[PDB]
């Protein structure tokens, strides 16, 4: 009971009748937030257009490569489109071992570790 009463007190401060009220800004305060909200959503637009511009440029570099490759005769006696048809195959792309977990598991960090990189890694 004493431990359960402690839980119920945690749900009491979260009651709709006890949580803090909606903010009340004056004008100069309301306009300062309107200016900060307008610059944040603009910063997000710039980061979006940049983010999406690079993706479109990577995509076009792939297209220009896979368009040339589609019209290449070779190597040797292989006919036109061979390498192109071999590059468009998706064998193993949608399986369990598609992306190595040593690469995906390494998410970014604010500061590096004691050993940032392991040059002594051996096969």
């Amino acid at each position: 009971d004493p431990r359960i009463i402690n839980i119920l007190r945690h749900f009491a401060v979260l009651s709709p009748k006890r949580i803090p009220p909606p903010l009340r800004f004056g004008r100069n305060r309301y306009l300062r937030h309107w200016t900060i909200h307008r610059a944040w959503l603009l910063f997000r637009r710039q980061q979006r257009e940049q983010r999406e511009r690079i993706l479109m440029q990577q995509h076009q570099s792939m297209s220009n490569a896979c368009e040339e490759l589609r019209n290449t005769e070779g190597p040797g006696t292989r006919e036109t489109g061979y390498l192109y048809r071999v590059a468009m195959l998706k064998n193993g792309v949608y399986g369990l071992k598609s992306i190595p977990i040593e690469y995906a598991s390494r998410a970014l960090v604010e500061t590096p570790g004691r050993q940032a990189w392991n040059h002594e890694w051996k096969r």
Binding site: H10, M62, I101, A107
Partner: protein, 309 residues
Amino acid sequence: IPDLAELETRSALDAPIPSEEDKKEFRPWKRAADRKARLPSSRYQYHPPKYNRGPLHPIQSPPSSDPIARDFVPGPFNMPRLKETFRTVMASDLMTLAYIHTPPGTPKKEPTERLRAWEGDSPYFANRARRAPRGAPELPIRERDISFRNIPEIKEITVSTFVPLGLKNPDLLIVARAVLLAMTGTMPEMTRSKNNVVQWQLQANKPAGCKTTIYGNAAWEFMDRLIHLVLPRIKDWKGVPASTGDGSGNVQFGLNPEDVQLFPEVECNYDMYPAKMIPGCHIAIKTTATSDRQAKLLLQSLGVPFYSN
């Protein structure tokens, strides 16, 4: 230029940044103290109402983005390191790994009506009702290709707990609700049972669990806590089953009570919950993907191991 003349000339954005001498005289704490009085209130005293009564009611509510609104939630406090990771390294790898080339002058693909109509010379066919979905009774969504305009991402996550024994012992529901509160940072909503089963002592229409939903950054942070702090600490964990997937780009899997108390938020105050009351949970990761093989390819990009099942 005449066009530049139509712009506002009293530009406040083109003003110089403040001065230091004038910044040293700006002391909001001293203004109120040295005032020795209360400033008169402004005659503008509009306050958002508690109810929305229509688009034509005299008193209208502002959008949730308005700070004075009742739905306002303060904006981002940080950048989740797993969203930055995906948008920085992985997004281009999925776009490169899953890429099918379309020649330049390829005509667009016109989708065909999935509810077919009767076509023919029989006079009956004219006013026949459209045919049923071929195969299943409900139409499944069609898969979109992964391109520079469709990168599958994580949208939200739903954590839920089903506690049937809470009908006998109401304390199991208070504890289950407090774990999902600390595990997620939201206030869960109680759920009820829907079917009667005498063998299982299950009565219908009685509170028997809770559920949360976290969106945006909160969902990316929850995955970081889960993939990198919780799942690695489960004893003899093989991975997420390869059978998971609803056929629309959403992944589901369940945890045990011995794995829910591994969450840093639950193991810090583990002594405040009674014994043998911390529940398990069902975690549904909803992605922007459009297939089971796209959602599995997305989680593999985040460090989620799968095992054949």
